[PDB]
Every structure is written in C-alpha cells, then in structure tokens.
Amino acid sequence: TEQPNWLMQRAQLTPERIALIYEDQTVTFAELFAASKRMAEQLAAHSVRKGDTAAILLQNRAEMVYAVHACFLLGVKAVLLNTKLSTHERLFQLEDSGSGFLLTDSSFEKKEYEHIVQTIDVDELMKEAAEEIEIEAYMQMDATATLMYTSGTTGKPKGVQQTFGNHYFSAVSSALNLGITEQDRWLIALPLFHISGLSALFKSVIYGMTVVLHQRFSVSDVLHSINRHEVTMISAVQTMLASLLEETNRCPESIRCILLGGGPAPLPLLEECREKGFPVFQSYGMTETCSQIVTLSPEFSMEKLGSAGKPLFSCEIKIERDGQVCEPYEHGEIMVKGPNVMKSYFNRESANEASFQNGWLKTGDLGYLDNEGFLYVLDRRSDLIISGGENIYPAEVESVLLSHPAVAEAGVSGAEDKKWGKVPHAYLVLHKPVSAGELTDYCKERLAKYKRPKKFFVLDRLPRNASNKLLRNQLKDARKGELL
Amino acid sequence: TEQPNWLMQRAQLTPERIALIYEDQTVTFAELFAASKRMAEQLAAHSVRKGDTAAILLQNRAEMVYAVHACFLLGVKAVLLNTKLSTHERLFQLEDSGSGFLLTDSSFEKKEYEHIVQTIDVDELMKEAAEEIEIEAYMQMDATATLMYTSGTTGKPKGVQQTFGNHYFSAVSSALNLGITEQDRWLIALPLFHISGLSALFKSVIYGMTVVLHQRFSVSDVLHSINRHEVTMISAVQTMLASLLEETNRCPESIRCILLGGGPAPLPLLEECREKGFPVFQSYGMTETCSQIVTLSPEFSMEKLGSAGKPLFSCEIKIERDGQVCEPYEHGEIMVKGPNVMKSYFNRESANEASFQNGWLKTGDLGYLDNEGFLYVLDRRSDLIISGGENIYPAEVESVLLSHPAVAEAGVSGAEDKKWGKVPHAYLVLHKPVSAGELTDYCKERLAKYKRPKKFFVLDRLPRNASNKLLRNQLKDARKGEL
Numbered sequence: 023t024e025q026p027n028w029l030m031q032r033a034q035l036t037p038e039r040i041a042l043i044y045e046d047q048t049v050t051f052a053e054l055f056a057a058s059k060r061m062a063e064q065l066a067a068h069s070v071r072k073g074d075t076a077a078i079l080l081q082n083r084a085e086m087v088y089a090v091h092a093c094f095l096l097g098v099k100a101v102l103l104n105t106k107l108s109t110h111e112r113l114f115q116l117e118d119s120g121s122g123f124l125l126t127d128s129s130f131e132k133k134e135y136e137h138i139v140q141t142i143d144v145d146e147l148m149k150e151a152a153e154e155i156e157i158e159a160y161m162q163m164d165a166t167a168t169l170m171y172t173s174g175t176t177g178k179p180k181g182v183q184q185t186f187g188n189h190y191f192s193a194v195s196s197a198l199n200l201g202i203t204e205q206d207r208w209l210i211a212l213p214l215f216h217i218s219g220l221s222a223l224f225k226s227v228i229y230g231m232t233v234v235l236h237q238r239f240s241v242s243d244v245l246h247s248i249n250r251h252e253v254t255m256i257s258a259v260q261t262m263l264a265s266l267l268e269e270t271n272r273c274p275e276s277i278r279c280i281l282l283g284g285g286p287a288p289l290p291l292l293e294e295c296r297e298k299g300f301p302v303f304q305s306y307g308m309t310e311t312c313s314q315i316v317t318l319s320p321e322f323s324m325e326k327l328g329s330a331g332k333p334l335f336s337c338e339i340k341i342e343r344d345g346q347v348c349e350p351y352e353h354g355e356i357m358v359k360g361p362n363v364m365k366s367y368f369n370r371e372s373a374n375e376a377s378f379q380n381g382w383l384k385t386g387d388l389g390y391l392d393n394e395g396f397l398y399v400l401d402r403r404s405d406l407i408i409s410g411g412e413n414i415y416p417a418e419v420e421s422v423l424l425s426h427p428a429v430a431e432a433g434v435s436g437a438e439d440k441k442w443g444k445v446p447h448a449y450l451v452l453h454k455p456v457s458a459g460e461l462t463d464y465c466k467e468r469l470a471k472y473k474r475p476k477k478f479f480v481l482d483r484l485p486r487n488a489s490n491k492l493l494r495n496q497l498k499d500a501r502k503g504e505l506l
Numbered sequence: 507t508e509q510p511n512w513l514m515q516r517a518q519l520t521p522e523r524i525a526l527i528y529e530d531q532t533v534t535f536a537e538l539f540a541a542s543k544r545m546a547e548q549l550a551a552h553s554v555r556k557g558d559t560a561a562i563l564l565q566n567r568a569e570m571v572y573a574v575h576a577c578f579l580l581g582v583k584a585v586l587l588n589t590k591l592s593t594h595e596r597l598f599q600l601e602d603s604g605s606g607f608l609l610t611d612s613s614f615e616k617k618e619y620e621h622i623v624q625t626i627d628v629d630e631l632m633k634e635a636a637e638e639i640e641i642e643a644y645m646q647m648d649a650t651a652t653l654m655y656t657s658g659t660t661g662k663p664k665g666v667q668q669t670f671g672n673h674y675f676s677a678v679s680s681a682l683n684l685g686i687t688e689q690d691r692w693l694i695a696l697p698l699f700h701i702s703g704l705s706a707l708f709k710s711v712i713y714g715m716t717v718v719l720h721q722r723f724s725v726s727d728v729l730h731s732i733n734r735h736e737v738t739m740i741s742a743v744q745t746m747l748a749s750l751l752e753e754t755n756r757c758p759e760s761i762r763c764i765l766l767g768g769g770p771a772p773l774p775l776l777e778e779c780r781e782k783g784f785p786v787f788q789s790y791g792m793t794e795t796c797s798q799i800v801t802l803s804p805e806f807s808m809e810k811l812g813s814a815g816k817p818l819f820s821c822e823i824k825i826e827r828d829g830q831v832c833e834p835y836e837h838g839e840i841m842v843k844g845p846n847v848m849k850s851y852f853n854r855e856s857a858n859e860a861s862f863q864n865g866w867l868k869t870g871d872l873g874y875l876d877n878e879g880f881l882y883v884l885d886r887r888s889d890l891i892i893s894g895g896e897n898i899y900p901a902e903v904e905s906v907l908l909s910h911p912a913v914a915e916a917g918v919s920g921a922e923d924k925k926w927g928k929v930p931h932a933y934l935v936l937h938k939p940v941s942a943g944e945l946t947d948y949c950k951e952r953l954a955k956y957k958r959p960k961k962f963f964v965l966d967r968l969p970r971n972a973s974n975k976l977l978r979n980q981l982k983d984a985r986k987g988e989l
C-alpha cells in the first residue's frame with residue numbers, strides 16, 4: 023500500500039547524480055531532496071498541513087520542481103494550474119479543487135486569489151527560516167498525488183485525481199517500453215502543469231535520471247541544450263516537432279527517443295521524420311492515463327503510419343460501440359485500463375459513473391485496432407479541438423460567448439491550421455450587432471488565449487438535430503458571413 | 507489488483523522476440539504462450555482446476571518453463587521442488603503444500619508419490635489431445651503464484667508464498683537498478699526451482715528479454731553459450747564465479763552484469779574479478795524476498811569490499827538489536843521491507859508471527875549499515891550452512907541423524923571448504939557403535955547429497971548452555987574422526 027518517498031529514496035541511493043539542469047543550475051538528487059524538504063518546512067510554517075490541498079501557479083523552473091516534491095513530503099495534494107488561464111478560469115479550479123493555498127510568484131497577480139486561498143510567493147518563502155519537520159517518508163499508492171483539470175466537454179473542466187501509484191506505474195511501463203540506461207537524460211520544454219512535463223519529474227526520481235528543464239520552447243535553445251547536455255530523450259507535441267524539422271535536416275546524434283504525444287500529427291511530418299532519421303515514438307495518452315498508454319516504435323512508423331502503437335506493459339485497450347466490442351478495423355470508442363489510469367474525477371459523481379464501465383475508462387475518442395492490435399485514433403471528435411497540444415472544449419468557449427448580451431446562440435468548431443493543427447472558429451446567432459473585436463475583448467477576460475476564436479461567423483440559425491442538439495461538425499457548411 | 511497475464515501480454519506485444527534458448531534451440535514469446543496454453547489445456551483434461559496446487563519436479567528444460575506458465579494460465583499455485591531432495595524430503599513438501607498434482611517426467615520415479623498426489627508425466631502429457639479452455643487472462647497481484655521451501659531452522663522447511671506482485675516488483679526493481687535494453691539476454695545455469703533461476707523467467711516476459719537456459723553448469727559450455735548468443739547478464743553463486751575465473755582471465759565482451767548471490771563470497775575472489783574486468787554485482791536476497799533485495803554496483807566493489815550494497819528501489823532495510831534501533835556500524839538483525847517480500851510462510855502460524863514485526867521481515871542474518879547506508883552481512887549464523895549456494899539447516903540434518911537408533915545426540919556445523927564455501931560436519935554422541943559408512947547409507951535415504959555430513963565425529967557430550975540447548979558454534983572443538 024506504500025512505497026518510500028521516491029525523491030527521498032533516490033537521494034539515499036544516488037545522491038550525487040544530477041536530478042535537474044535548469045539554465046545555469048545543476049541540482050543533484052541530494053540537493054533536490056534538501057531543497058524540497060526545506061520548502062516543506064517553510065510551507066508548514068505558513069500553516070500548511072497533511073491532508074491539505076495546494077495549487078501551484080508557476081512557469082517551468084527549479085522552484086516549481088521543489089514545490090511539487092515539497093507537497094508530497096508534507097502529505098499535501100498538488101493542484102497544477104495552467105499559467106495561460108484567465109483569472110476567471112483559475113478561480114473556478116481553485117474553488118472546485120478545495121485548494122487552501124496557492125504557491126506562485128511575483129510574475130502572477132496574487133491579490134486576485136486572496137479571498138479564496140492563502141497565497142504564498144515561493145521566492146519569498148525560500149528566504150525564511152523555519153523549524154525542521156519530520157517529512158512524510160512514505161507515499162501511499164492509492165492516495166491522490168496531483169490534480170490536473172481537463173475534459174471540459176460540458177463547459178466546466180474536471181479535476182483528474184492522479185495517484186502516486188498511477189505515476190509510478192506510468193514511469194515503470196514507459197521504462198519497460200523504451201529501455202533505461204544511466205546515460206539517459208530527458209529534456210522537458212513543455213509545461214510542467216501538463217502531465218507531459220510533470221511525468222518526467224517522476225521518471226527522474228524513480229529511474230535516477232537527469233531532466234533538462236526549459237521554461238519556454240525555442241528550437242535553437244533546445245538544439246544548443248541537447249548538444250551541451252548530451253540529451254537522449256525529449257517530449258514533444260507535433261507543433262514542436264514541426265518547428266524542430268523546420269530548423270534542421272538532421273537529428274542530434276545523442277537523441278534516441280522523441281516522445282510525441284498530445285494530439286494527431288500530420289502524416290507528411292511523420293514521414294519526413296522517418297526519412298531524415300528522427301526517432302519519433304508516436305503515442306496516445308491523456309491526463310486521465312497520467313501520460314502515454316499506447317506507443318508506436320519507429321520501426322513500425324511507416325508500416326503502421328497513422329497508428330499510435332500498442333498498449334504499454336500492464337495496460338489494456340479495446341474498442342467498443344454501444345457496449346459491443348468491435349472487430350478489427352471496425353470503428354468505435356477507445357476504452358483503456360491499467361494501473362496508470364486515474365482514480366476518478368474529483369467531485370464529479372455523474373461523470374465518474376458515466377466514464378467507467380467495469381474497470382475500463384471511456385476516453386471519448388474514436389478509433390480502431392488493426393489485425394495485429396495496433397491502435398488507430400480517428401480525428402472525429404467535435405467536442406474537443408487540439409491546438410498546439412492544448413485541449414480546447416467547444417462547450418467552454420460557447421458558454422463564454424453565449425453569456426454576452428448580444429449573442430443568442432453559439433457554436434464552436436475546429437478549423438485546420440498549418441501551425442497549430444486546429445484552431446477554434448465561432449458561429450453566432452446575434453440579438454444585436456457586435457464586432458469581432460468586441461467579442462475578442464470579452465473572451466480575453468474569460469478564456470486562455472489559445473481558446474479564443476480566431477474567426478467569427480454570423481448566422482440566422484445553427485444546424486441542430488431533431489432534439490435541438492447543436493451539430494458542431496456542420497457549422498463550417500452553414501449559411502454565414504464573416505463577422506468583422 | 508490485477509494485471510494481464512505477463513506471458514500473454516508479452517506475446518501480444520513482441521511475439522517474434524526470442525523468449526527462450528535451450529540446447530541452442532529458440533522459442534519465441536508467441537511459441538512460448540502457445541506451448542504453455544497447450545499444456546494448460548492438457549492439465550485441465552487431467553482435472554487440474556483453478557485454485558488447485560501443483561508441484562513441479564523437473565530439471566531445467568523448456569518443458570519446465572511451459573509448466574510454470576501453464577499453472578499461471580490455469581490459476582494453479584506452482585510448488586517448485588528441489589530435484590536433489592530424497593523421496594522422503596519431497597513427500598513432506600508434497601503433503602505440507604497441499605499439492606493435488608505432481609508434474610514431473612520419467613527421469614524421476616513417479617510411483618513413489620502416487621499415494622499423496624496425482625502424478626503427471628510432462629512428456630506423455632504433451633502428446634495428448636485436449637479441448638481448448640478459457641485461460642486466466644489476468645494475474646491477481648496479491649495471489650500466491652509460487653511456493654518454494656526453505657528455512658528449515660526448526661528441522662522442517664517452510665513454504666514461502668510468493669505472489670504475482672512480489673515477482674513483478676522484484677523484476678521492476680532489478681531493472682531500475684541494472685537498466686534494461688532490447689539487446690539484453692540473461693543466461694541461467696542455476697536451478698529453476700530456486701528463485702535465483704525462476705525469477706529470470708518473470709524478468710523475461712515482463713521485459714521481453716531472452717533467457718538462455720542451461721540444464722547444468724559447466725564453465726566451458728557457459729562461455730561458449732555467452733559468445734554464441736551474445737549474453738549480457740548472468741546469475742551466479744560464488745562457487746560458479748570461482749570456476750569461471752579458473753578457466754578464463756577475460757570476461758566475455760558482451761557480459762555487462764554478473765549478478766552474484768546466494769551466500770558470502772571470498773574477498774580475494776571479488777578483488778580478482780574487478781581487477782580482471784568481471785562486472786560482478788554482489789547481492790543479498792533470499793527465497794523470502796523473491797530474489798535480490800540489496801545489491802552492490804562494481805563502482806563500489808572496492809571501496810565497499812565486503813558489502814552487499816544498497817536496497818533496490820521501493821525496498822528498505824534496517825538493523826535492530828532486541829527491538830532497538832542500531833546506529834551505523836552497530837551489529838544487529840537485518841530486517842527488510844518491500845513489495846517483493848513474501849506474503850507469508852504457508853501454514854506456519856508461529857513462524858509468521860515471529861518473523862514479521864510491524865510490516866518488516868526478520869531475516870535471521872546479522873549485519874550492520876555503514877554511514878552511507880551500505881549493508882555488511884556478518885557471517886555468524888550457525889543455524890544455516892551454505893554449500894555452493896545451497897542452504898543446509900543443521901536442525902534438519904541433526905533430526906535425521908538423531909532418528910538413527912545408534913545416535914543419542916547430534917550437532918551439525920559448517921566446516922570451511924575451498925570449493926563449496928562450507929560443508930556440514932556431524933558431531934555425535936552414540937548409544938551403540940556405528941560406522942561412518944552406515945550413517946552415510948542411512949542419510950542417503952533422507953537427505954539431499956549436499957546436506958549429508960562430509961565428516962563424522964564422536965564425542966561424550968556436546969557443547970550446551972544452561973537450558974541444555976546446543977551451542978553449534980562451539981562444536982569444532984574438540985573430538986576424534988569417525989571412520
């Protein structure tokens with residue numbers, strides 16, 4: 023039911039191995055444990071207690087890694103907050119999560135949250151003297167470690183409860199797939215508040231593996247960093263891979279694995295990677311599976327071009343239509359099972375009842391398996407738009423648009439975008455005139471920037487079925503004029 | 507609480523990868539699943555059912571690997587029987603384990619067991635037709651998978667219940683320690699009825715890693731096999747490692763890990779290996795921990811010469827004397843904890859209550875930790891003698907000798923042996939005269955060969971304490987040889 027705290031044990035086993043490279047900082051596992059314990063002590067001095075919930079609002083930096091591990095050492099659930107969210111969106115997640123604290127810095131406006139949580143500046147925190155404490159030396163496998171918000175298919179996002187067990191089994195299953203060696207170093211230049219970034223921190227302490235952390239994604243900085251630090255592994259979404267290939271015709275020699283996730287990739291991009299020797303491992307995974315659950319090796323990437331691969335060891339996938347398992351090549355809903363699959367959504371009784379069926383999690387994605395068991399994900403959802411690896415839920419954007427007094431009806435669907443894959447376009451029935459710039463300013467207060475419509479259209483009515491349900495995939499074809 | 511059956515999932519993921527190389531013949535993971543399922547179907551025809559217990563009595567053969575997996579596919583607990591045991595010793599284990607079946611072959615005299623269990627000849631079995639069955643597609647993590655007998659400190663061995671989860675976590679913790687890559691291949695020339703050998707079969711399906719299987723250990727054959735099959739990992743006890751160093755000064759280029767376990771190694775052997783480039787990983791582990799739980803990397807093998815190393819990831823160790831915490835360098839009993847530690851001894855209420863203390867397992871070994879947490883095991887037990895990696899329990903050998911009519915008292919202690927490490931010597935007080943030859947003939951029927959006393963001594967009395975309990979460490983003084 024319990025394991026020794028991974029950072030504590032890692033520091034005991036290999037104290038001088040490098041845990042973290044960030045800018046001009048190198049942090050050993052010993053140093054990482056010491057800094058996380060110290061930050062835990064300082065958090066306890068600000069009244070944080072075992073069983074509490076603390077939200078983290080930070081850009082990628084060493085202090086963010088300290089904060090996550092400090093929470094674990096205190097027995098505190100960590101809520102990772104997307105830094106691009108508006109105040110409005112963050113407030114809901116702070117309240118819904120039951121957070122009592124917000125750990126952030128001066129680059130965010132802490133005063134807007136003071137009425138709901140105690141705000142703590144991590145940089146001021148680390149300057150304070152505090153009494154030493156006895157850390158939580160064990161992680162309970164079934165305890166919720168981290169909460170991440172996703173799947174706002176009805177308008178409001180859901181908090182995914184990711185257990186210590188989930189994170190352990192994710193890391194172990196990935197190691198069994200990719201192999202692990204002492205020379206491996208993993209470069210993370212995508213947000214630590216996504217499980218794409220955060221999972222590398224757990225791989226780091228479980229494997230004893232250096233993570234090279236970047237705050238932002240810059241292709242040239244990433245190429246220099248790979249060279250300087252002999253990076254062997256890197257995670258990416260397809261926009262990042264596309265940017266890498268636009269910069270260089272050759273993959274750095276030390277790279278043995280580019281873990282590609284977070285949405286569909288254009289097939290010409292994957293073919294170019296294979297042609298030019300980029301070792302791309304396409305994968306299928308989500309917040310709810312604590313990162314990858316199906317992954318595709320480069321050796322099959324052209325024979326199975328279009329496939330996400332096979333389930334990781336200990337994990338399972340099946341395709342069902344209305345409760346009937348599908349034959350090979352028959353389309354249906356992707357359902358997943360494994361020790362990396364989340365406990366449940368936080369305080370979403372109805373969603374949990376709907377989403378789980380006899381141990382299996384319904385993903386909401388459509389796909390099929392071929393005759394060898396390889397998964398093919400079909401880009402068919404209209405309740406989800408993926409832009410640069412960021413999920414956008416039409417229901418959330420539509421809810422904001424509908425709240426405007428001039429808007430009578432609202433539909434949002436994804437338009438093709440060469441750089442981002444898909445971007446949201448808005449389709450509106452108006453009571454009164456309103457400009458695109460007016461609505462954009464209105465969305466700016468309520469939506470992260472990547473969620474705001476890139477184009478607006480005005481219609482007399484929206485396409486709906488006999489039950490009055492919006493048919494989002496039919497919005498692009500309706501009679502409309504562009505709204506200026 | 508459950509995982510897909512490891513062999514079934516591995517065959518789904520990498521069907522054409524080589525699972526097993528035996529007599530230089532190859533079995534893919536697809537072929538291994540097919541053969542294990544076929545054997546499971548044939549066992550079901552013989553009325554083996556989910557929840558039964560089946561004992562396995564086989565030398566290292568491909569069919570033994572099939573039998574273990576077939577048991578899992580049927581939901582049947584597998585009791586691994588030591589093939590060197592006398593019929594007498596095996597009958598105790600068949601009855602104590604609750605086995606309903608014995609899977610063996612014609613190299614053993616199955617007729618001796620048919621009054622306790624239904625005996626099945628694996629070779630005759632594989633020739634039979636059988637209906638298809640629905641296999642157990644899942645392994646329950648806390649269900650007992652295998653039983654192995656050990657720790658006969660009271661005079662009879664105890665069956666260690668090893669769960670599927672125990673074996674999974676052993677394999678995962680070892681991979682995190684050693685690293686894993688697609689090119690790894692592991693050679694097993696150790697008995698599969700010990701966890702030293704058997705654990706490689708679970709590593710094989712969890713990692714997708716070939717096991718090169720030898721029925722016996724001969725240094726020449728092992729060296730040729732390593733080079734023929736590009737073996738990168740090998741398991742050894744110190745007698746095997748010493749034999750290797752006698753036949754070659756150069757470690758084969760492909761070997762990256764020699765996992766050494768099963769008892770103390772002579773320090774000059776460890777020094778010579780590192781001097782000559784043999785990548786020896788000393789380890790401390792036992793049946794009760796489903797193989798290694800502490801291991802020492804070659805980078806520390808000189809600075810920490812004499813150490814067993816540090817605990818594997820997820821595992822813990824502490825040193826306690828009389829229930830009190832021991833500071834670094836203070837001697838005490840080694841206690842271990844982790845997800846690879848056994849469920850319990852089977853039907854040994856008193857031993858389980860004594861051996862487990864607040865989630866920790868008492869090992870019966872003495873040791874200390876240095877100031878960096880490295881474990882030093884102190885060779886001080888007199889209730890256990892290790893001969894070529896085989897555990898021998900003085901209490902068991904003494905019980906056999908005591909049962910002889912001419913023997914009034916018996917004490918057994920370990921004598922130094924250049925080849926085996928320690929061998930048992932017997933110290934006797936006799937009612938009537940009896941020769942060493944007569945006593946050896948009597949022991950042949952009741953003890954595996956390596957347990958039989960290599961020398962016999964006669965005494966008027968044995969060293970005892972106030973409570974009249976034998977003091978085995980004092981036996982060596984003093985006596986005359988019995989011929």
Ligand SMILES: CC(C)(COP(=O)(O)OP(=O)(O)OC[C@H]1O[C@@H](n2cnc3c(N)ncnc32)[C@H](O)[C@@H]1OP(=O)(O)O)[C@@H](O)C(=O)NCCC(=O)NCCNC(=O)CCC(=O)c1ccccc1C(=O)O
Nearest residue numbers: 212217218239258283284307308313314409410411412472
């Ligand atoms: C793609 C990223 C890196 C782009 O950010 P960046 O700012 O560097 O882009 P630039 O080219 O420099 O231009 C900046 C302009 O572009 C706007 N912008 C930035 N991001 C977006 C966006 N997503 N959509 C639309 N616009 C965007 C900026 O506002 C700016 O605009 P201007 O002011 O100039 O007009 C960055 O977006 C990024 O990091 N994306 C990745 C997020 C992510 O990690 N998603 C994965 C989430 N899914 C999971 O975590 C589960 C699956 C998973 O675990 C995984 C995923 C990937 C890889 C591995 C795994 C795994 O299983 O381990």
Ligand SMILES: CC(C)(COP(=O)(O)OP(=O)(O)OC[C@H]1O[C@@H](n2cnc3c(N)ncnc32)[C@H](O)[C@@H]1OP(=O)(O)O)[C@@H](O)C(=O)NCCC(=O)NCCNC(=O)CCC(=O)c1ccccc1C(=O)O
Nearest residue numbers: 696700701702723742767768791792797798893894895956
């Ligand atoms: C040492 C071995 C290989 C010697 O056997 P072998 O038959 O090859 O010896 P020879 O010299 O060739 O034979 C001549 C005669 O020698 C007699 N004999 C054989 N063995 C012994 C013995 N142990 N003691 C005394 N005499 C012996 C025979 O009578 C033979 O006569 P013939 O009949 O041939 O004419 C062999 O004994 C061996 O394989 N030993 C190892 C057994 C073992 O696996 N022990 C480990 C048990 N412990 C564990 O499993 C837990 C720890 C663990 O898991 C581990 C252990 C080691 C490595 C790794 C791990 C791990 O953690 O994964």
Ligand SMILES: Nc1ncnc2c1ncn2[C@@H]1O[C@H](COP(=O)(O)O)[C@@H](O)[C@H]1O
Nearest residue numbers: 172284285286305306307308309330399
């Ligand atoms: N290889 C892939 N192909 C297509 N879609 C993907 C792939 N990997 C992930 N996705 C999508 O990304 C989503 C992840 O959402 P989340 O992790 O909840 O932010 C999944 O539910 C899929 O819809």
Ligand SMILES: Nc1ncnc2c1ncn2[C@@H]1O[C@H](COP(=O)(O)O)[C@@H](O)[C@H]1O
Nearest residue numbers: 656768769770789790791792793883897
């Ligand atoms: N590195 C080591 N040094 C000393 N003794 C060991 C070592 N590894 C294993 N052992 C012994 O082997 C025993 C395990 O035997 P078993 O119960 O048959 O697995 C332990 O209790 C120890 O006495």
Ligand SMILES: [Ca+2]
Nearest residue numbers: 336337359360
């Ligand atoms: Ca599963």
Ligand SMILES: [Ca+2]
Nearest residue numbers: 673676705796
């Ligand atoms: Ca094992």
Ligand SMILES: [Mg+2]
Nearest residue numbers: 216217218309
């Ligand atoms: Mg995420």
Ligand SMILES: [Mg+2]
Nearest residue numbers: 238239240241
């Ligand atoms: Mg950029």
Ligand SMILES: [Mg+2]
Nearest residue numbers: 424425426429
């Ligand atoms: Mg309105």
Ligand SMILES: [Mg+2]
Nearest residue numbers: 427428453454
């Ligand atoms: Mg109105």
Ligand SMILES: [Mg+2]
Nearest residue numbers: 532533534537
């Ligand atoms: Mg073959």
Ligand SMILES: [Mg+2]
Nearest residue numbers: 644645646649
């Ligand atoms: Mg089971």
Ligand SMILES: [Mg+2]
Nearest residue numbers: 656657658890
């Ligand atoms: Mg013992």
Ligand SMILES: [Mg+2]
Nearest residue numbers: 722723724725
């Ligand atoms: Mg031999």
Ligand SMILES: [Mg+2]
Nearest residue numbers: 844845846847
């Ligand atoms: Mg355990």
Ligand SMILES: [Mg+2]
Nearest residue numbers: 648669848849
């Ligand atoms: Mg158990």
